[PDB]
Amino acid sequence: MNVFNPAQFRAQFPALQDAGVYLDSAATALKPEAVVEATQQFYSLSAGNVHRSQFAEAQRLTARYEAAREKVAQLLNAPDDKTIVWTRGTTESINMVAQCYARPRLQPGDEIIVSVAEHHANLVPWLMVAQQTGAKVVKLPLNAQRLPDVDLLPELITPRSRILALGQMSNVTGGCPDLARAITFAHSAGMVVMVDGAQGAVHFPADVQQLDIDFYAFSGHKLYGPTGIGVLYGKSELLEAMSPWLGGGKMVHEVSFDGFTTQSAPWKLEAGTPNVAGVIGLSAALEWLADYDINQAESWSRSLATLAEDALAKRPGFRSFRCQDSSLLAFDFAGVHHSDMVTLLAEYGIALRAGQHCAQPLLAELGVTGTLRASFAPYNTKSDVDALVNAVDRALELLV
Amino acid sequence: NVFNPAQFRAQFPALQDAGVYLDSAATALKPEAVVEATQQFYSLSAGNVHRSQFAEAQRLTARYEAAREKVAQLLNAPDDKTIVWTRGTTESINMVAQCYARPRLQPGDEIIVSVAEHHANLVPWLMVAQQTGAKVVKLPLNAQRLPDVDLLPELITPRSRILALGQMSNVTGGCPDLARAITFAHSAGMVVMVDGAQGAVHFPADVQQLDIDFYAFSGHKLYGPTGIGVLYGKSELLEAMSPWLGGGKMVHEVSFDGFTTQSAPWKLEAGTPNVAGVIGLSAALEWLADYDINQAESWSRSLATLAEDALAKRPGFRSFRCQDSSLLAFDFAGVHHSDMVTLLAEYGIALRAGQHCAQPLLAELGVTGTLRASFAPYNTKSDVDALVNAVDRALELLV
Numbered sequence: 001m002n003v004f005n006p007a008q009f010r011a012q013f014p015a016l017q018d019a020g021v022y023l024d025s026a027a028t029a030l031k032p033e034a035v036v037e038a039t040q041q042f043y044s045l046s047a048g049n050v051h052r053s054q055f056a057e058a059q060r061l062t063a064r065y066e067a068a069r070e071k072v073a074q075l076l077n078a079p080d081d082k083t084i085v086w087t088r089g090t091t092e093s094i095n096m097v098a099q100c101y102a103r104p105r106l107q108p109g110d111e112i113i114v115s116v117a118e119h120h121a122n123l124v125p126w127l128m129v130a131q132q133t134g135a136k137v138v139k140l141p142l143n144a145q146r147l148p149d150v151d152l153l154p155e156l157i158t159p160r161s162r163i164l165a166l167g168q169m170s171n172v173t174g175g176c177p178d179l180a181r182a183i184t185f186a187h188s189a190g191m192v193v194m195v196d197g198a199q200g201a202v203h204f205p206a207d208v209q210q211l212d213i214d215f216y217a218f219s220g221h222k223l224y225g226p227t228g229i230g231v232l233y234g235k236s237e238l239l240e241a242m243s244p245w246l247g248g249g250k251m252v253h254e255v256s257f258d259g260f261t262t263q264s265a266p267w268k269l270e271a272g273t274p275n276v277a278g279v280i281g282l283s284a285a286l287e288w289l290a291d292y293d294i295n296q297a298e299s300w301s302r303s304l305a306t307l308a309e310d311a312l313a314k315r316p317g318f319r320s321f322r323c324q325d326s327s328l329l330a331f332d333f334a335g336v337h338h339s340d341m342v343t344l345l346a347e348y349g350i351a352l353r354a355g356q357h358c359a360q361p362l363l364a365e366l367g368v369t370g371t372l373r374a375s376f377a378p379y380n381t382k383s384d385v386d387a388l389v390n391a392v393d394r395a396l397e398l399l400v
Numbered sequence: 401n402v403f404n405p406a407q408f409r410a411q412f413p414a415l416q417d418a419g420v421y422l423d424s425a426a427t428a429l430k431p432e433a434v435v436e437a438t439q440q441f442y443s444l445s446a447g448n449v450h451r452s453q454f455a456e457a458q459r460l461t462a463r464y465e466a467a468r469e470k471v472a473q474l475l476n477a478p479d480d481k482t483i484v485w486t487r488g489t490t491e492s493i494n495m496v497a498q499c500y501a502r503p504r505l506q507p508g509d510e511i512i513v514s515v516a517e518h519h520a521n522l523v524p525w526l527m528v529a530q531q532t533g534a535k536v537v538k539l540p541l542n543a544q545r546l547p548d549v550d551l552l553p554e555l556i557t558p559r560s561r562i563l564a565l566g567q568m569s570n571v572t573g574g575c576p577d578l579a580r581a582i583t584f585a586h587s588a589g590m591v592v593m594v595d596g597a598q599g600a601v602h603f604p605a606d607v608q609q610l611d612i613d614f615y616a617f618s619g620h621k622l623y624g625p626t627g628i629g630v631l632y633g634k635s636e637l638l639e640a641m642s643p644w645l646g647g648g649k650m651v652h653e654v655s656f657d658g659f660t661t662q663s664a665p666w667k668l669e670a671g672t673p674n675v676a677g678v679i680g681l682s683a684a685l686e687w688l689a690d691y692d693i694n695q696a697e698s699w700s701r702s703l704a705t706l707a708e709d710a711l712a713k714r715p716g717f718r719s720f721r722c723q724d725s726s727l728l729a730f731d732f733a734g735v736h737h738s739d740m741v742t743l744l745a746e747y748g749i750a751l752r753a754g755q756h757c758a759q760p761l762l763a764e765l766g767v768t769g770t771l772r773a774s775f776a777p778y779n780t781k782s783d784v785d786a787l788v789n790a791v792d793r794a795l796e797l798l799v
């Protein structure tokens with residue numbers, strides 16, 4: 001059977017040696033060779049109809065491209081590959097849902113429930129469309145365990161509620177709310193749910209059929225893939241109901257100076273020349289990833305994060321914001337400037353970050369202006385944990 | 401600096417396999433500098449640690465931070481804050497229509513759009529017109545198949561707000577009198593959306609000299625990455641624009657009561673940037689800066705002329721080419737375009753046919769589609785000879 005082997009997973013990443021102790025995968029992931037090579041091939045070959053010596057390679061690229069939607073569908077257990085739409089990333093995916101589905105449907109007084117744990121990508125677009133339509137954004141607060149309070153959700157739902165915006169997984173706490181329950185509550189009230197899966201797609205890829213998710217968005221660069229590429233999954237009937245997004249070539253069928261008609265989804269929502277390199281590279285990432293049991297890989301990442309948290313908790317002034325033994329470890333050290341720690345740790349070959357992580361409301365809930373964040377991926381090791389802990393010890397001694 | 405076609409050509413690794421590649425107008429082959437810079441970006445951490453590749457990491461960072469400035473230099477833009485990153489020319493235009501025009505259009509307002517416009521610079525205007533009660537007014541072609549800039553005064557009215565005009569058509573290669581169109585537009589207090597998807601490649605617009613309001617082009621046309629484009633806008637117009645997409649980066653402060661944004665260009669750039677695209681475009685531009693574009697373009701144009709002159713000697717030949725452009729759109733009486741494209745491919749020649757996202761233009765020309773051979777500075781005289789011979793072989797088997 002498939003048994004996850006950390007060492008062989010590591011060997012697939014050319015950037016690793018230089019990266020040192022890389023603990024910022026939650027911001028962006030390192031790429032496996034398959035993605036590098038697929039991208040190199042794409043930019044080193046004509047996309048035209050002639051190939052005088054590299055026809056096999058060109059054919060492979062075309063196959064990766066034509067199979068890209070299906071590989072996303074397989075990741076999400078989507079019913080078919082026409083429910084997959086390409087975008088610049090999670091951010092565009094959500095804006096598209098807000099503008100193409102919600103905006104033409106929202107009326108003055110309608111309500112949009114958004115969790116206080118939402119990354120800005122899944123908050124700002126809703127504030128925008130609320131302003132545009134007279135709808136109101138309603139806050140879904142955290143419970144005592146720092147998760148969006150799904151128990152409280154039924155009380156917050158009213159006859160005016162139309163949309164629920166909820167992150168499958170937080171990029172700060174790594175916390176995953178009761179998504180199945182939340183969706184059941186939302187659907188009880190005839191609402192549609194926008195699920196931000198920028199983190200979740202990497203660690204617990206959502207079964208969109210089982211969870212009956214209406215819309216799901218994630219980004220390639222986080223999923224071991226290219227920048228400038230993302231996904232919007234939508235139920236077929238919802239994609240059909242959506243207005244066109246950007247106007248231009250590809251998405252259109254017929255055009256005159258009187259008006260235009262469009263293709264059906266997904267093409268309706270994809271104007272202009274696609275990010276072909278991005279699609280091919282994401283396809284390569286997914287195909288590569290398919291050889292690994294994501295469940296075992298994630299448990300490995302989570303186990304390292306736990307070793308780290310347990311050890312760091314023995315140091316003075318430690319505070320963890322981590323939920324549910326997540327691969328993501330957001331933390332703080334009292335009486336220490338975050339920028340100083342990040343810098344000291346970088347000098348020790350440890351790559352992580354601090355800051356607001358595009359989640360101001362969440363941080364405000366936690367009583368902080370920022371946090372340090374070490375995030376673990378399946379190419380990390382126990383020696384990485386030791387290195388982090390050791391560097392922190394030195395940092396604490398040096399920053400007095 | 402003297403341009404050498406052979407030196408230019410030797411920088412494109414795809415050529416050996418590509419055969420005779422004559423579809424650069426659709427998308428351009430990439431020089432080694434773009435391939436390598438992309439390879440490096442994806443082969444190295446973007447983190448703050450570099451144990452063994454510090455030098456390369458620094459170069460990548462340099463390319464990234466210098467990217468806006470290199471675009472500015474190409475367009476002679478006043479400063480690099482006038483450069484906004486997009487996914488392509490298409491998004492660039494949609495952004496202008498949605499972020500500048502939409503909030504300012506009252507019902508009855510008029511948007512003048514040339515009949516030569518690529519869909520990218522037409523559909524967004526049909527959209528915003530429907531959204532605002534504004535109306536799209538056609539600017540037709542003159543006798544030379546160019547947008548009739550001289551007719552603009554009869555078309556401009558007190559309701560005229562926007563002019564959408566392409567610097568260069570992707571079918572005829574024709575370039576209308578942009579300076580004159582702009583003077584008229586500005587006399588009526590209008591703003592001009594210049595579609596430079598082709599123009600940026602062949603005759604990059606001096607946006608200051610031409611007093612252009614908005615200018616859009618795509619990286620993939622300009623020997624660069626896919627999924628990256630540019631919107632240039634006068635700093636006043638960018639400041640006046642509403643935000644585009646909402647999310648990270650573009651915001652300053654965010655709460656459940658509302659949000660504030662950065663100023664331009666970041667105001668208009670939500671979420672994680674296509675860093676690979678930006679770095680790759682930077683690399684393309686930096687590499688391109690070493691070559692005299694005028695000499696490179698002169699070469700491409702000369703090849704197109706040798707091709708047109710030859711093909712013109714064949715029976716039933718028809719050309720839609722304007723101004724001795726490096727783009728050669730043509731047709732042969734009595735041939736299915738798809739059939740000729742297929743046979744030319746079989747003979748080692750890569751071109752295309754179809755509507756080229758310009759249905760209104762083709763309707764005006766009286767055709768349903770055309771063949772198009774587009775020449776780039778990495779093409780050669782032998783490419784022309786090969787194209788001609790392959791057309792001869794094709795015409796035998798068809799006509």
Ligand SMILES: *Cc1c(COP(=O)(O)O)cnc(C)c1O
Binds near residue numbers: 091092120230
């Ligand atoms: C990264 C992230 C996003 C945004 O992804 P982009 O690629 O920047 O659009 C949104 N939500 C969460 C939770 C994220 O982690």
Ligand SMILES: *Cc1c(COP(=O)(O)O)cnc(C)c1O
Binds near residue numbers: 568
């Ligand atoms: C190619 C082209 C476009 C579209 O560019 P995308 O990268 O597809 O957005 C728009 N206008 C003209 C004239 C073009 O040639």
